[PDB]
C-alpha cells in the first residue's frame, strides 16, 4: 500500500538529473494517505530500549535554553515535560521497526550504500531543532500533524554558528521560501541547504537520511584494509647511501612511502572489498540480531517452498560488487561473502527490489552452496524468515 | 668510550653498498672493550616496571617445552628459575637506560626513523630463543660472555614453523656458517636470515633493531591523517542515473572513492606530516616522561651558557622533513612541530648527531622562537637538560 517511489508523478531519471544534490524540491502528497505506523508513545518506547541513539531538545523549559538530554532513557523522564517547545529525535528506527523500514522501498533509485537511516521525530506544538544545515541529502516526510518549513535555496559554504549552545545553530538565517506540510507531503533537501522547521501541532517527521563518505572517514576506515593484506610489500632501501643528516626523512624515502600506499589504493579487487565492508558496517550501536534458534538447510528449503518469505532487515547495510572474473562479493553489515561465478547473480537479487520467495529464488534454490549462504545470512540476522 | 660507527675497519659507504639488506657481516671487536652497562638484576628490575615489554623463555624445565612468560614481572618470578636453558628479553631498554641508548650513536649512518629499539637479553648457559627469522635488519652486539651463533646465508621466502609453541621456531634449519662471539663482537643480519644463538655461559646480548613499515602497517596508521583534514572532500554524485540494480557498488563510485584516497597520498606536504608522526610515534607502552620542574626561557638560556648540555632521550623518535617553501616540520614522539623557513635549519641540528651545547646552539639561542620550542621539547621529555 505504498507507491513505487517517493517522487509522486516525477520519474527518477528526471529527478536525479535536475534536483539530486543540486536544489531542493517540494513534492506535495508524495505518499497519499500515509500516516505514521508508529505512535509518539511507541517512539518514546524505543527511546528507552538499550543500544538506541536518542536526543531530547528543549528550546525552553529546561534548566538552560536549548538543553540537550541524551539517551538511553527511563519512562519517568517523559511525563515531566512542558506542554510545548521540546522535541524527541530517535535514530535508526528503520532498524528497530520493520514497518518503518517499509518506507525505504520508495527510494530505491538511489543505491543501497548511499542510504543511512530513517530517524523519527516527535514534537508537540512549537517544537523544533532550530535553523540548521546537514552534510547529507534528506527526504523530510510528514507522517503526522503539520510542520512549517522555512528554507534557503542558496547552499552555505561557510557555517556561521551560534556560540556556546551545544546544538548546531545558524546565527544569521534568511528564508526565501516558507511551506506548510501535511501528512504525505515530502520535502527533498540536498546537502548544506539551511532549513528551519516548526511544529504547528502535535506532529511527527520521518527523516530519510543518506550518507556520503568524506576523506576523514575513509582514512579512519583504512585499518580494515589490513585484513586482506598478509603484510604486503615492505619498505626496502638496499641502495641506501650514508645519511648526511640522520634525522631527515629524505625525498627518496617519501617517494617509496607514496608508492606503497598507491599500490594499495590502485588495487581494485582489494579496494572494492574494503569499501564494501566499511560502508555497510553498522555506524552506531545496532548490529544485526541473530534469531532464536538454529535452522537446517533442509528445513529452510522446505519452509521456503511452502510460501515462507525472506525479509531484508537492513537494506542500507546490504550491497555487492562484481569482479572481472565474473565472481562477486556480497556485503552484509560489515562482512564479506565471496560468490563464485556460478552464484554471482544472487547478489543483485538479495540486495535488490524484488521480493524473496520460492518463485523468485527458484533458479539457485537447489544448489547446496546457495542454501548455506541463506543459512548464514539468516543466522547472522541479515535476513528474517517470515511465515505466510 | 665508543667508536664513531659500529663497523670498525669498514667504511659506511662500503657497508651500505655491499651488505645492507643483502649479505650478513661479522665484525669482530666492532666495539673494543665494550661491556654491558647494566647487569642481569638491573635488567630484571626493568622487566618488573609497569608498561615494559619483557619475555621469559624456558626451552626446558618449564611447565612445558618452550614455555613463555610475559611481563611485567615481580622479583619473585626470578628466584626459582632453572639453573640453565632459559632467557630474559626486554624491549626498548634504550628508552629506559641512557647508557644503553649511548650505543645508538654508532649506527647514525642510518636515518633515525629507520631505528626501532635496543633489545637487551640475558641468558645462562644453554639459553636461547631458538632458531628463527626476523623481518628486519639487526646488529647483534655481544655485551657479555660467549655466544655461539649459527646462520644461513640464503634468506627465507616462506617460513615453515613448528606448530603450536607460542614461539616462532623453524622446523627445518640447516646452517652453513658458525661463529662464537665475545664481548665487543657484532653480527649484522639482513631481513629474513635464519639465525640460531646459544649462550655458552652467562650471556648478555644487545640487539640493535631496525624498522621498515609494510603496507599493512601504513594502512593501520592512516587514521592519523584525519587530524589535518578538517573533514576533507566528500563523495558526490550529482549526475547519478537511476540504479538498474540498487545494491551494486558501481565502478564509477569506486573510481571516485579511489580518487578521494589518492588525493591524500599525492598531496606530498600533507603525507610528509602524517608519516613523520606515525613513524616517530611510540611503538608500545612506554610514554616519554616530563621533568620534575618547569624551566623558563631565561633559566634555560642561563644554564646552557653555564655549561649545560641537552640530551636526546629517544633518537629513533626524532625526525624532520623539509617542505617546498623552505619551511620544515620537526617530528618528536609522534608530535609535529612546525618551523618557519628562518628557523627551518635547527631541525637537522636537534635530530642530528652533533652535541647540543651553548656553542652548537649559539646562533639560535638569541631567538625567542627557538627557546619556546626547546621549552616544549623539554616539557614533553624529548630532550633532557644535563649539567656538565
Ligand atoms: O663469567 C662468569 O662466569 C661470571 N660473570 C658474571 O656472572 C657476570 N655476568 C654478567 Cl651478564 C654481567 C653483566 C654485567 C656486569 C657484570 C656481569 C658479570 O660479572
Ligand atoms: O636466589 C637463589 O638462591 C637462586 N637465584 C638465582 O640463581 C638467580 N637469582 C636472581 Cl635474583 C636472578 C636475577 C636476575 C637474573 C638471574 C638470577 C638468578 O640466576
Ligand atoms: Mn536536518
From TrEMBL, chains A, B:
One of its GO terms (molecular function) is metal ion binding. Pfam families: JmjC_2, WHD_ROXA. Its cofactor is Fe(2+). Keywords: Dioxygenase, Iron, Metal-binding, Oxidoreductase. Residues 99-227 form the JmjC domain. Mn(2+) binds at residues 132, 134, 195. SMART domains: JmjC. PANTHER family: MINA53 MYC INDUCED NUCLEAR ANTIGEN (PTHR13096), RIBOSOMAL OXYGENASE 1 (PTHR13096:SF8). This is Cupin 4 family protein. It comes from Rhodothermus marinus (strain ATCC 43812 / DSM 4252 / R-10) (Rhodothermus obamensis).
Amino acid at each position: 500500500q505504498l507507491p513505487e517511489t517517493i517522487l509522486g508523478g516525477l520519474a527518477p531519471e528526471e529527478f536525479l538529473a535536475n534536483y539530486w544534490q543540486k536544489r531542493p524540491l517540494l513534492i506535495r502528497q508524495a505518499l497519499p494517505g500515509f500516516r505514521s505506523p508508529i505512535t509518539p508513545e511507541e517512539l518514546a518506547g524505543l527511546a528507552c530500549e538499550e543500544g538506541v541513539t536518542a536526543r531530547l531538545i528543549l528550546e525552553k523549559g529546561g534548566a538552560y535554553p536549548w538543553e540537550v538530554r541524551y539517551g538511553p532513557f527511563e519512562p519517568e523522564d517523559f511525563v515531566a515535560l512542558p506542554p510545548t517547545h521540546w522535541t524527541l529525535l530517535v535514530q535508526e528506527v528503520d532498524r528497530l521497526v520493520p514497518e518503518v523500514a517499509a518506507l525505504l522501498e520508495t527510494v530505491r533509485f538511489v543505491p543501497n550504500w548511499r542510504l543511512d537511516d530513517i530517524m523519527v521525530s516527535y514534537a508537540p506544538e512549537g517544537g523544533t531543532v532550530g535553523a540548521h544545515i546537514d552534510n547529507y541529502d534528506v527526504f523530510l516526510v510528514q507522517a503526522w500533524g503539520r510542520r512549517r518549513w522555512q528554507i534557503n535555496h542558496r547552499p552555505v559554504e561557510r557555517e556561521e554558528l551560534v556560540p556556546g549552545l551545544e546544538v548546531r545553530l545558524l546565527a544569521h538565517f534568511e528564508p526565501d521560501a516558507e511551506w506548510i506540510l501535511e501528512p504525505g507531503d515530502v520535502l527533498y533537501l540536498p546537502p548544506r541547504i539551511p532549513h528551519y522547521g516548526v511544529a504547528l501541532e502535535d506532529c511527527m517527521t520521518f527523516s530519510i537520511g543518506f550518507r556520503a563518505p568524506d576523506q576523514a572517514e575513509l582514512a579512519e576506515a583504512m585499518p580494515r584494509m589490513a585484513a586482506w593484506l598478509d603484510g604486503g610489500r615492505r619498505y626496502a632501501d638496499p641502495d641506501l647511501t650514508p645519511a648526511d643528516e640522520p634525522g631527515e626523512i629524505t625525498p627518496e624515502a617519501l617517494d617509496q612511502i607514496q608508492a606503497l600506499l598507491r599500490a594499495l589504493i590502485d588495487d581494485r579487487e582489494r579496494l572494492a572489498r574494503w569499501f564494501g565492508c566499511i560502508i555497510t558496517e553498522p555506524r552506531r550501536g545496532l548490529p544485526p540480531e541473530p534469531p532464536g534458534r538454529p535452522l537446517s538447510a533442509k528445513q529452510l528449503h522446505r519452509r521456503l517452498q511452502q510460501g515462507a518469505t525472506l525479509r531484508r532487515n537492513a537494506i542500507p547495510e546490504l550491497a555487492y560488487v562484481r569482479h572481472a572474473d565474473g565472481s562477486a562479493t556480497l556485503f552484509a553489515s560489515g562482512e564479506a561473502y565471496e560468490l563464485s561465478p556460478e552464484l554471482a547473480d544472487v547478489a543483485p537479487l538479495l540486495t535488490g527490489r524484488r521480493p524473496l520467495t520460492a518463485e523468485t529464488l527458484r533458479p539457485w534454490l537447489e544448489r547446496d552452496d546457495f542454501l548455506e549462504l541463506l543459512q548464514t545470512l539468516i543466522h547472522s540476522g541479515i535476513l528474517s524468515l517470515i511465515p505466510a
